[PDB]
Amino acid sequence: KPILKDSMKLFEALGTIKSRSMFGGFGLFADETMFALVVNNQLHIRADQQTSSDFETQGLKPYVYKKRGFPVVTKYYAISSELWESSDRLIEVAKKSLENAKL
Amino acid sequence: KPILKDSMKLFEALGTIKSRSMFGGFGLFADETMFALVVNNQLHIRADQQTSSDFETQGLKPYVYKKRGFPVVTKYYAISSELWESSDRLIEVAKKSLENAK
Lengths: 103, 102
Ligand SMILES: [Mg+2]
Ligand SMILES: [Mg+2]
Prior knowledge:
The structure is a homodimer.
Chain A: H1 3-10, E1 18-22, E2 25-30, E3 33-39, E4 42-46, H2 49-57, E5 64-67, E6 70-73, E7 76-78, H3 81-84, H4 87-102
Antiparallel strand pairs in A: 1-2, 2-3, 3-4, 4-7, 5-6
The structure holds magnesium ion (2 copies).
One magnesium ion binds at residues 48-49 of chain A.
Organism (chain A): Vibrio parahaemolyticus serotype O3:K6 (strain RIMD 2210633)
Domain TfoX N-terminal (chain A): 10-101
Protein name (chain A): DNA transformation protein
């Protein structure tokens, strides 16, 4: 349920967190850079090009936004339930994603 | 519980809705003007100076953000459960608050 608010609150470890409508859900931004997406009541983290290609080769699938039969494959991967139980770990995952998003 | 998400969706008619860390919670902005705040799992609406002054005289208390003994009194008043349960009316209240803020 309160996944959006709980995500934004957790990631304040990265400074001010901003959100706006992105890809059918809500994007999360730090330092003017999107690093996360909350959609289908699930937290997703941004994989850079290299990470996303690898993930796909290894059988993982990113979130896809659809409208009237037009799909948009995103760079956003649903996190595991276990990661949520691991607050500091998840914070580090977001920090690394934000870092890769800025490169 | 997803007050924030629900609120961001509810207020889509007012303008483009964005949120950000504000005053210990999350501020809601319509085309760059803040009109609401989600904190303490409750939606709060912005009262302009006149409204807030009247409210305090009339025994109502705004949300106060506090860190390490430093309190910051805000202009944000918690809505009633009845108003939260009355979607169209809440949109109009937010719309007025936004007008008052501009
Ligand atoms: Mg990239
Ligand atoms: Mg929420």
